[PDB]
Paper text:
HIV-1 Env is a homotrimer of gp120-gp41 heterodimers that mediates fusion of the host and viral membrane bilayers to allow entry of viral RNA into the host cell cytoplasm. We characterize Ab1303 and Ab1573, heterologously-neutralizing CD4-binding site (CD4bs) antibodies, isolated from sequentially-immunized macaques. Ab1303/Ab1573 binding is observed only when Env trimers are not constrained in the closed, prefusion conformation. Fab-Env cryo-EM structures show that both antibodies recognize the CD4bs on Env trimer with an ‘occluded-open’ conformation between closed, as targeted by bNAbs, and fully-open, as recognized by CD4.
Numbering used by the authors:
A (entry chain F): 1 to 9, 11 to 27, 27A, 27B, 28 to 95, 95A, 95B, 96 to 210
B (entry chain E): 1 to 52, 52A, 53 to 82, 82A, 82B, 82C, 83 to 100, 100A, ...
Amino acid sequence: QSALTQPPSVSGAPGERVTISCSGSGSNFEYSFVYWYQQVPGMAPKLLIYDNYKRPSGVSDRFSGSRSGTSASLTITGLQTEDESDYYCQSYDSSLTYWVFGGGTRLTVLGQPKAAPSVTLFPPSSEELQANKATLVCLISDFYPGAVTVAWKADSSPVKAGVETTTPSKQSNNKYAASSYLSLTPEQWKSHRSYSCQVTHEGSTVEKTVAPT
Amino acid sequence: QVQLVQSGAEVKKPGASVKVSCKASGFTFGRYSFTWVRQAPGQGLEWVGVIVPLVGVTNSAKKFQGRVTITADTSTNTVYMDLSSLRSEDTAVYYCARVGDRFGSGYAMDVWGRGALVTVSSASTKGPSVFPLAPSGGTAALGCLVKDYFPEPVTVSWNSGALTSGVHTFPAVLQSSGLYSLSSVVTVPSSSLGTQTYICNVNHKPSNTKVDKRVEPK
C-alpha cells in the first residue's frame, strides 16, 4: 500500500475558513477518489465527503472537498467550536483491495481564553501508611489550553522516580483536567520534610506543598 | 436510521483471541461490503479488513497476515472478525463500517458502528483499595483514592448520590504494574465539614467490588 500525508493539525477562529491538505505517494493518486471522515473524540468516525467532492445527507454544506494536482483538500467554512475534531482523508486501492487512511488532522478552534490550572495536593492517608503504602495525589483542573507539565520535588530536589501522570482530559465545562501520582514508601515520605507538585502551563508554574503531620 | 450494532468491550491476555461481531439493523447484507477499522489509543484510524458476503471475498491488511479471519452469517446478517495471538499493540477500538451503495458501488464507509474496545494486558482482575483523602468563606476539598484495580471502569458516588455538587472524579492513571488508580474529590463549604458525614461509594463492576469509605477531617 501507499501512504496519504495529512497536516499534523489546523487552527482557526470562529467564522474563519480552514483547509486541510492530503497528499498521496501512489502514482495513480491524482485520479483515484478521496474520502474525508470526521471523528469527534469519544465517538465513531463519520463520513463527510466521498468521491472527491460529494456530500452525504445531513452533512453541513460548509464542508467541501476538492482536488488540486496530486492532492486533495477539505475546506471548513464558518468555523464553529464543535468543528473541533480529527479529520482523516482516505483512498482506496482497487488493485490491492486496501483502504488507506491519512494520519489525521486535529482541528483546534481558537477563541477560548487562557485559564490557569487549579492544584490540589493530598498527602498519603494514615490508612495507606498502615498498609505499608504511600501515594501523593496531585489533582489539576480548570486549565485551557489542554496541556500542562508536572514536576515533583522531594524537599528542594527533583524526583522523577514513581511519577505517574495522565494525559489532559476535557472537563464538562470545556476546560481540561489532569492527575499526577507519586508512589513512595512510608519511610521515603517520613524521610523528606515535604514534597511539591509543580504544574507548568503557559510559562507559569503553580505549586503546592505537603509535609508529614 | 440503519445501524451497525457491535458486541461489547472485551479484556484479553496477550496470546489469546478475540471475536467482535457486527449485526445489520434495518437492512440486510445485499450487495454491501463490511470493513473493520481500528484505532489504538492516541493514534489514527487503521484499516484492518473487509468482507463482501454476496461473493464471499475477504481481505485484510498485510500486518494482520495469519492473525485475522473475517466471516459472515447471512441468515442473521452478522459479520465477525477474529483476531488471534493478541499483543499490546492490538489494544484498540474496533469499528465496523458499511461500504458501497445499494448496488455494491462506491468504496466510502458511510455507516459506522459505535465501536468495541479491546484491551490486551497481562494484568489479572483485581478490586481496588479505597483510601480517604482527608480535608486539612473558604471551601474545603476532600476525596477518595481508588488504588490498584483492573480493569476499567470504576464508578464513584458521594453519599449514595445525594451529594452531586462539587464532585470531580478525575480520569485514572495506568501504573507500570498494569493496575489503575483514580481519585474523586468534592469541594464543600468548609463550615459544612462539621455538619454532616461524607461517604464515597466505590463500585468496580468487573470484580463486583463495592466499598463505602467514610472521609473524616484529620
